[PDB]
Amino acid sequence: FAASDPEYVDTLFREQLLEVVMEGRELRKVAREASNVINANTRVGDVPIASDEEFARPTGQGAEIRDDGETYTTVAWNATKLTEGSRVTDEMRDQAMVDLIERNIQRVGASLENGINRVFLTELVDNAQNNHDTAGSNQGYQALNSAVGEVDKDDFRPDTYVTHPDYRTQLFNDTNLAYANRAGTNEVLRNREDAPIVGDIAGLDMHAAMSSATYDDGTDIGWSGGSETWGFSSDGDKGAVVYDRDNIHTILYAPNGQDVEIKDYEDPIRDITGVNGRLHVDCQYSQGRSSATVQY
């Protein structure tokens, strides 16, 4: 009738396509906060490790000061190249309402960050020297307590916990813990401003809430797998890691600059634009006895 939009919906105007593309599942980016980040000059290298601290010696007056010098060892890094690309036709690059190149730069960046997080989480879970076996009992807080207990008992100060979604269901089942920082410290600082000041738990000032998908179970394409099961559902699953963030090192190498390198190419034979991303990444404990895993 008359003239209404239901009649001329493709005739006199187009339905809007929103210039913003809404995100897929986003996995939790923590590694840059949840570890010490080393901008390496070389793909392979080693970090010096110092001997544990000792105590100065009761000494007589005029007596020789004796030597207990710092003895040293090293841990190797071998940074693996993580890469993702995307290709777009020239026609597609031009016609998109969305900036497709900017989006592919975001996707590549995001996928590389997930890679860093996978490397970090795999190292953290596999190479922790301590372990609290819950044997299917007292799970959640008594387990977190006991895991802090294991790190602290070996005279390391834990300051961070990394957690699986299922462990975050067993922890925080207590209504006492309802005011805790369950979101992840990095989530609250990235995606909020007014943080609830009370939220720290067990003297750990970071919760690195992490995703189920992030650990390397070797089921993903091009990934070979780690020794453990990341989960909290069956006997043997590692559901959390309690650790010192200054005692695990994420080593990032880039040949150009210090961080993720984005390159573009134009193919004039096929009219395809590519966006490629690269970073080289390893993760290593400087001391793995600074960390305890919680086992179901």
Binding site: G24, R25, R87, I221, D267, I269, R270, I272
Partner: protein
């Protein structure tokens, strides 16, 4: 091929790597990831079973008579399989818009090699290494 992510279905990116991207005319309606062979002069149609009919995989959905792009050999591709494929399996077209193993077909040599294994009806990652045509 298509990918379920909750309520959403997504198209599968057929092309993993490679630049063997060549222009043909569709002899029938063709879908993304579908194996094809030459039915006429620069004209391509859906492959039948048991070999002798493979040039590449269709990159995007087309109607009959439209210009099509194919991934040919030295492309790594995402493709749908009618049976379980393990790594190092040679595959060729099944005649159903999908791929099967050389071991299952009556043919004695394939056109692609499975890099990433898949169950029946799922996406394998494969490398295209050959074309197959009429030998009599």
């Amino acid at each position: 091929a298509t990918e379920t992510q909750g309520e959403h279905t997504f198209p599968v990116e057929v092309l993993i790597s490679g630049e063997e991207l060549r222009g043909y005319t569709a002899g029938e309606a063709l879908s993304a990831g579908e194996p094809v062979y030459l039915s006429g002069d620069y004209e391509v149609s859906a492959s039948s079973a048991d070999g002798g009919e493979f040039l590449g995989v269709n990159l995007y959905d087309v109607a009959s008579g439209e210009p099509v792009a194919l991934a040919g050999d030295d492309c790594e591709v995402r493709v749908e399989v009618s049976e379980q494929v393990t790594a190092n399996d040679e595959i060729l077209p099944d005649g159903l818009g999908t791929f099967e193993t050389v071991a299952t077909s009556a043919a004695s040599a394939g056109v692609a090699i499975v890099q990433e294994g898949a169950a029946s009806g799922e996406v394998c990652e494969a490398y295209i290494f050959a074309v197959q045509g009429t030998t009599a």
